DNA sequence: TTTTTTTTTTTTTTTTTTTTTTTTT
DNA sequence: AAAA
């Protein structure tokens, strides 16, 4: 039904004019004829005859390649979507390979549209007809959408070779007013206007009877009076008001920045969807707007900065397995999608260089994807009633959260922490607006030289937690006796972050590590057995437990004795214990009404017939009360990751 | 390809005219000449042949000097990010060393621009024409940028010889509305209006065929009717609301006062 | 727990309109 | 000179 499409849509025929400029080898290329049929698939569905016409377009080997081959990709499912290239991109392949003939095709294209309107209304232009001409001419560059509060917001696609803020190439940007459209409607639209002027004068040159003696003269007078209308301001404001509907595109704002496999970079957009990661520095159709100003380059260990960073980094963390495991964890900061609930906190001392690593990642990732949050938030000690809260926000879309030191060692209640790590959704509010929910997908790190008090026993609480301790410390007198001591550079933090190449080198390392973990056991973090890690963590679990310490301080090593009333004094005995052993405090005592049974006291803990859980015997201690009776060091390179054991 | 240089771009031919009347002693010297090479290189990369011809202004340096070194300098300036010294500076040296000649050159330039618009639209001026003509002159001052709050903001370059605040000289200042731009467009633009009127009446003086019996009469009537528009409040407000698009400079507010090696003082 | 966020603006007209002199009756 |  080629004729059908021809008559059904003049644009379809124009679209046919433009597709005739494609060389036959384009139709030969297997992934390309799949691309074009998919591109037309997402734009309407009645173009099956046109798609079938494309099967007969340069069919030098259609029978050789299979008659039921190109149509099969569309006839198998006229429904269904793939989130692929739509229209307004086929024009890009058309003009990138067939110049000149493309510019005249579009030139006569809107020329017919404009010349139709000038004849139909005796040369009396208006706002809407101009808006239609503009959209058919530069409708493949602008998108208008409506935000949450509701205004007609303008988004512009940046192209190389035009004034633009650094790092904002090959991606959409927000515009308060389409300013460059205002100059565009005044300069390039004039050229279209002139072609009309020549056409009417040429027809006036050809003699004829009264049908042209006054009719052409009237239009010329009307047209010239209307020629100056375009330069007016209120008229130009009206055209922008009209064109808002033509450039309207439903479902564009909420699909912005949704793909977690696309990252905006200073030299295009970086795709981590497939291995290896690929850089896009040409036209595409992915709705991405946020970015960071760090240019991406392929990972080269031969760069002096890459070696410089790797050497200092390797010295910072001595253990090979710990070094691999930590950076693999930090490599997830590039990802912006759902992540497994892992909390990383680790201990150090003095000028340990902890601040250097967090600071490096934050600027490398950029503000759009990384941010600094109040350390108090981690404590979770603070509670928020029905009141605005801002620091809870800012976590949207981010993939990295880093903290700093506290006043001292701090206690962290499970509340306000369970939802900070879990792959769930949380809701809150702040200045203005109201309650709203947002998916949390950011990696979390918080290291300090202060131990974090944890008062619980639940496995679910102590399953999304990992602990580490630093061992290498920096001092200005590095005696050559202790390996855990190295010299410092004041420039190392004050500068070396201001060098863009350092960020470019560091970002490459992060990309490479994420590729390694992805090429590793299908992602995930639970694997990679680092004996140094997860052992100090459970050692920290054997510590940081007041009850267990109390158990093997007063009742254990003296269980054969018998000074027991009930669960009541055991709490008081535990109360006075932590009062001195730790600090004086009180609790709604029901926690031990079951935790004590959850403990190892069952040897003597047996509930009496009238409940009271009378322990079979212990010795409450007063006065001194003693004598109571009861890895491979890497050869030369470790970023190469070594074989599977590593 | 000098003909290609002078063909595709009237801005290039204007830069050709400005490139003349220069003190070639500076071109002979390495520092200042390299500085102006950097200035022109930072202003787009499409002007590679024009920069090459700038190497052939007083060709002695291109015949006695680092030819390949100079072209490599221009190339690296094109593909590097620096402080980005731009135009409106070579204009400064041209005015500094060479008064007179440049004044009538720019006068003829924007006068020709306005005359071209008048002849194109039968002397029916409109806000865009006046806005572009105004941007053709001035331009050095009046940088416009969009704040973080979404409000257009105007900035003026303070110069000696005006009523300014204390210690505000030789640096940008914030302006709620370009008031002295308003009075400038009211006063100085009238000189161009008068020059155009004189040119029209002079052409009317010369005798010709039936064109002058009615056609110049129509042109002069339309121009006279449009003359009073520049004094209208709504017309001038529209002219400003059109012109702030042209004087827009991307990435200006956030890069303001960023340099820690520069201090603002009373005497500069 | 006010406190400051909330309130409460806050743009608020503006364009235009009319005419528009010329034109052409 | 008056109406569009
Ligand atoms: N890999 C490295 N190479 C060279 N110098 C380093 C390295 N790591 C740390 N340093 C030096 O040691 C210092 C870093 O320690 P600090 O940042 O002071 O300690 P921190 O644990 O990060 O937290 P602070 O700052 O002590 S509260 C810097 O002054 C660096 O000069
Ligand atoms: Mg530090």
Q: How far is the CA of A582 from the C1' of D1 (A)?
A: 110
Strands, DSSP E only, in A158-231? 172-175
Q: State how far residue B189 is from chain A, nearest Cα, in angstroms.
A: 19
d(CA A506, CA A497): 10
> A128 CA to C13 C1', in Å?
24
Nearest to B229 by CA among B219, B239, B220: B239
By C1' distance from the Cα of A221, the closest nucleotide is C23
Ligand 1, atom 5: closest residue by C-alpha: A488
Pair A416, A380: CB distance under 8 Å: yes
How far from chain centre, in Å, is Cα B128?
16
Closest CA to A242 of A178, A176, A150: A178
Q: Which residue in chain A has the smallest CA separation from B43?
A: A163
Residue length, chain B?
268
Place of tokens 């221009």: B74
End-to-end CA separation in angstroms for chain A: 63
For residues A26 and A372, give the distance between their C-alpha atoms in angstroms, rounded to a whole number. 50
Q: How far is the CA of A346 from the centre of ligand 1 (A)?
A: 16
The phi, psi pair for B60, rounded to 5°, reads -60, -40
> In Å, what is the separation between the CA of A261 and the C1' of C8?
44
Nucleotide nearest residue A387, measured CA to C1':
C5
CA A240 to CA A154: how far, in whole Å? 11
Residue A387 gets which letter from DSSP? S
Question: Which residues are CB-contacts of B134 (< 8 A; sequence separation ≥ 6)?
Answer: B185, B189, B239, B243
In A, which residues are within 8 Å of B245 by CB distance?
Answer: 179, 182-183
User: What is the distance between the alpha carbons of residues A70 and B245, in angstroms, rounded to a whole number?
Assistant: 49
Q: Distance, CA A343 to ligand 2 centroid (Å)?
A: 21
Burial label for A626, CB within 10 Å (0-12, 13-18, 19+), is exposed
Beta strands A443-445; A452-453: pairing state: unpaired
Q: How far is CA A171 from the centre of its chain?
A: 14
Provide the resolution (angstroms): 3.7
**Whether the Cβ atoms of residue A5 and residue A47 lie closer than 8 Å to each other:** yes
| Chain C nucleotides near the protein (CB, 7 A) | 1-3, 5-7, 15-16, 21-23
CA A487 / ligand 1 centre spacing (Å): 9
- Residue A229 DSSP code: G
Whose tokens are 């058309």? That residue is: A94
**How far apart are alpha carbons A582 and A193 in whole angstroms?**
86
With CA atoms as reference, the chain B residue closest to A175 would be B150
Q: What is the DSSP string of A496-565?
A: SSS-HHHHHHHHHHHHHHHHHHHHSSSS-SS-S--SSTTHHHHHHHHSS-HHHHHIIIIITT--SS----
> Which of B121, B238, B251 lies nearest to residue A165, judging by beta carbons?
B251
A105: CB partners within 8 A, 6+ apart = A14, A17, A18, A21
A479 is in an annotated binding site: no
Q: Give the alpha-carbon dihedral of A115, A120, A122, A123, to 10 degrees.
A: -30
The encoded tokens of residue A417 equal: 């922490």
Cα gap A636→A628, rounded to integer Å: 56
The three-state DSSP-derived secondary structure of chain B is CHHHHHHHCHHHHHHHHHHCCCCHHHHHCHHHHHHHHHHHHHCCCCCHHHHHHHHCCCCHHHHCCCHHHHHHHHHHHHCCCCCCCCCCCHHHHHHHHCCCHHHHHHHHHHHHHHHHHHHHCCCCCCHHHHHHHHHHCCCCCCEEEECCCCCEEEEEECCCCCCCCCCCCCCEEEECCCHHHHHHHHHHHHHHHHHHHHHHHHHHHCCCCCHHHHHHHHHHHHHHHHHHHHHCHHHHHHHHHHHHHHCECCCCCCCCCCCCCCCCCCCC
- Using C1' positions and the CA of A386, the closest nucleotide is C1
What are A434's strand-pairing partners? none
Which contiguous run of DSSP H or E holds residue A373? none
Question: A473 by DSSP, 3-state: which?
Answer: strand
B108: closest CA among B196, B2, B12, B177? B196
From the list A165, A224, A232, the residue facing B127 with the nearest CB is A232
Report the sign of the C-alpha dihedral through residues A178, A183, A187, A189, in that order.
positive
Interface A–B counts its CB contacts (< 8 A) at 34
Whether the Cβ atoms of residue B135 and residue B147 lie closer than 8 Å to each other:
no
E strands, A183-277, are 262-265, 268-271
Can you state the angle between helices B127-136 and B101-120, rounded to 10 degrees?
A: 160
**Residue partners of B164: CB distance under 8 A and separation at least 6:** B158, B173
Q: Which is nearest to A279 in space by CA: A288, A268, A287, A294? A: A268
Q: Find out whether A468 and A475 touch, Cβ atoms under 8 Å.
A: no
Tokens 């290896």 found at: A276
Distance from CA of A232 to the nearest CA of B (A): 6
Tell me how far CA of residue B80 lies from CA of A231, A300, B42, B52, B84, in angstroms: 38, 21, 9, 19, 9
Cis peptide bond N-terminal to A276, omega within 30: yes
Residue B248 touches chain A, beta carbons under 8 Å: yes
Q: How distant, in Å, are the alpha carbons of A345, A371, A421 from that of A401?
A: 12, 6, 11
Burial B172-205 (b: 16+ CB within 10 A, else e): beeeeebeebeebbeeebeebeeebeeebeeeee
Q: Cα(first)–Cα(last) distance of chain B, in Å?
A: 43
Local structure of residue A347 (DSSP, 8 states): E
Ligand 1 atom nearest to A315, measured from its CA: 1
Partner A contacted by B150 (CB < 8 A) = yes
For A15-52, give the DSSP string.
HHHHHTTS-HHHHH-HHHHHHHHHHHHHS-STTHHHHH
The angle that helices A30-42 and A48-55 make with each other, rounded to 10 degrees, is 170
Q: For chain A, how big is the Rg over CA atoms in Å?
A: 35
Residues with C-beta less than 6 Å from any ligand 1 atom: A 312, 315-316, 348, 350-356, 405, 474, 488-490, 492-493
Strands of the sheet containing B152-157, edge to edge, are: B143-146, B152-157, B172-175
DSSP 8-state code for residue A231: G
Task: In whole angstroms, give the CA distance from residue B190 to residue B183.
Answer: 11
B63: which 2 tokens?
Answer: 């015949």
Q: Please list all protein residues whose beta carbon sits less than 5 angstroms from ligand 2, which is an ion.
A: A 355
Rounded to 10 degrees, what is the CA torsion of A503, A506, A508, A514? -130
Expressed in percent and rounded to 5, the helix, strand and coil fractions of chain A are 40, 10, 50
Q: Is the CB of B221 under 7 A from strand C?
A: yes
Closest atom, ligand 1, to C-alpha of A351: 19
Edge-to-edge order in the sheet of strand A262-265: A262-265, A268-271, A278-280
How far apart, in whole angstroms, are the C-alpha atoms of residue A225 and residue A203?
19
* Closest alpha carbon within chain B to A221: B122
Taking CA B210 as the corner, what is the angle to CA B207 and CA B215, rounded to the nearest 5 degrees? 90
Rg of chain B, C-alpha, whole Å: 22
B267 CB neighbour count, 10 Å cutoff: 6
For the purposes of burial, counting CB atoms within 10 Å of the CB of A91, is it exposed (0-12), middle (13-18) or buried (19 or more)? Answer: middle
Q: Scanning the structure block, which residue is given the tokens 């004050």?
A: A494
Is residue A369 within 8 A of residue A292, CB to CB? The reply is yes
Q: How many CA atoms does the CB half-sphere of A233 hold within 13 Å?
A: 19
Backbone angles phi, psi at A608, to 5 degrees: -75, 160
The partner residues of A154 in beta bridges, in order of sequence, read A144, A175
**DSSP β-bridge partners for residue A269:** A264, A280
Q: Experimental technique used?
A: cryo-EM
Inter-chain contact A176–B150, Cβ cutoff 8 Å?
A: yes
**A522: which residues sit within 8 A by CB, 6+ positions away?**
none
Q: A321 labelled as ligand-binding?
A: no
Task: Identify the residue whose tokens are 């590679």.
Answer: B48
On whether A576 is known to bind a ligand per the annotation, the reply is: no
Helices (H) then strands (E): counts for chain A: 24, 17
Q: Is A485 left (phi over 0), alpha (psi -120 to 50) or beta?
A: beta
Dist. CA A501 → ligand 1 center (Å): 21
Rounded Cα distance, A483 and A192, in Å: 76
- How many residues comprise chain A? 646
Q: Do A233 and B127 touch (CB under 8 A)?
A: yes
d(CA A278, CA A292): 17
Question: What tokens appear for A335 in the block?
Answer: 């990802």
Strand partners for A152: A146
């Amino acid at each position: 039904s080629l004729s059908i499409l021809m008559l059904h849509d003049p644009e379809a025929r124009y679209l046919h004019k433009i597709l005739n400029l494609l060389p036959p080898e384009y139709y030969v290329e297997y992934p390309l004829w799949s691309n074009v049929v998919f591109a037309l698939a997402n734009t309407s569905a009645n173009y099956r005859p046109l798609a079938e016409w494309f099967s007969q377009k340069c069919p030098e080997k259609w029978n050789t390649g299979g008659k039921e081959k190109l149509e099969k990709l569309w006839n198998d499912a006229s429904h269904h979507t793939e989130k692929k290239i739509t229209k307004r991109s086929i024009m890009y392949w058309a003009h990138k390979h067939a110049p000149q003939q493309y510019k005249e095709i579009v030139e006569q294209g809107y020329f017919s549209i404009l010349a139709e309107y000038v004849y139909s209304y005796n040369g009396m232009l208006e706002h809407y007809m101009i808006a239609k001409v503009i959209y058919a001419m530069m409708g493949n560059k602008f998108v208008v959408d409506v935000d949450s509060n509701g205004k007609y917001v303008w988004f512009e696609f940046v192209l190389p070779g035009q004034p633009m803020n650094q790092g904002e190439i090959w991606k959409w940007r927000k515009e308060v007013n389409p300013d460059e459209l205002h100059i565009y409607i005044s300069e390039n639209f004039s050229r279209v206007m002139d072609r009309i002027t020549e056409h009417i004068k040429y027809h006036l040159s050809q003699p004829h009877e009264s049908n042209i003696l006054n009719y052409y003269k009237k239009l010329l007078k009307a047209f010239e009076r209307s020629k100056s209308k375009i330069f007016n301001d209120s008229f130009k404001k009206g055209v922008i008001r009209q064109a808002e509907f033509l450039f309207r595109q439903r479902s564009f704002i909420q699909t912005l920045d949704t793909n977690p496999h696309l990252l905006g970079v200073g030299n295009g957009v970086l795709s981590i969807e497939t291995i290896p990661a690929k850089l896009i520095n040409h036209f595409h159709e992915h709705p991405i707007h946020q970015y960071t100003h760090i240019c991406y380059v392929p990972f080269n260990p031969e760069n002096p900065w890459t070696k410089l960073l790797l050497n200092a980094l390797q010295d910072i963390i001595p253990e090979l397995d710990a070094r691999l495991w930590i950076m693999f964890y930090l490599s997830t900061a590039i990802f912006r999608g759902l992540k497994e609930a892992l909390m990383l906190l680790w201990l150090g001392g003095g000028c340990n260089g902890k601040t250097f690593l967090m600071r490096l990642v934050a600027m490398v990732l950029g503000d759009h994807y990384a941010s600094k949050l109040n350390i108090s938030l981690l404590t979770s000690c603070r509670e928020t009633a029905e009141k605005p809260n801002s620091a809870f926000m800012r976590l949207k879309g981010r993939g990295y959260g880093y903290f700093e030191e506290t006043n001292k060692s701090e206690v962290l209640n499970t509340s306000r922490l369970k939802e900070m790590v879990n792959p769930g959704d949380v809701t809150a509010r702040e200045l203005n607006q109201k309650q709203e929910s947002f998916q949390m997908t950011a990696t979390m790190v918080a290291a300090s030289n202060y131990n974090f008090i944890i008062d619980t026993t639940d496995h679910g609480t102590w399953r999304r937690l990992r602990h580490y301790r630093s061992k290498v410390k920096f001092c200005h007198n590095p005696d050559p006796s202790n390996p855990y001591e190295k010299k410092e550079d004041p420039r190392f933090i004050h500068e070396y972050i201001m060098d863009p190449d350092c960020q470019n080198a560091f970002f490459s390392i992060l990309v490479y590590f994420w590729e390694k973990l992805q090429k590793e056991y299908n992602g995930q973090i639970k694997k990679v057995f680092c004996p140094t890690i997860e052992s100090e963590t459970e050692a920290y679990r054997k510590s940081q437990d007041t009850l267990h310490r109390f158990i093997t301080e007063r009742v254990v090593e003296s269980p054969s004795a018998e000074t027991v009333y009930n669960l009541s004094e055991v709490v008081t005995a535990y109360a006075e214990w932590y009062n001195t052993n730790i600090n004086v405090k009180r609790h709604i005592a029901l926690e031990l009404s079951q935790e004590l049974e959850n403990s190892v006291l069952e040897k003597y803990l047996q509930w009496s017939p009238n409940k009271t859980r009378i322990l079979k015997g212990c010795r409450i201690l007063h006065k001194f009360e003693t004598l109571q009776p009861g890895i491979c060091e890497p050869k030369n390179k470790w970023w190469e990751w070594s074989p599977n054991p590593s």
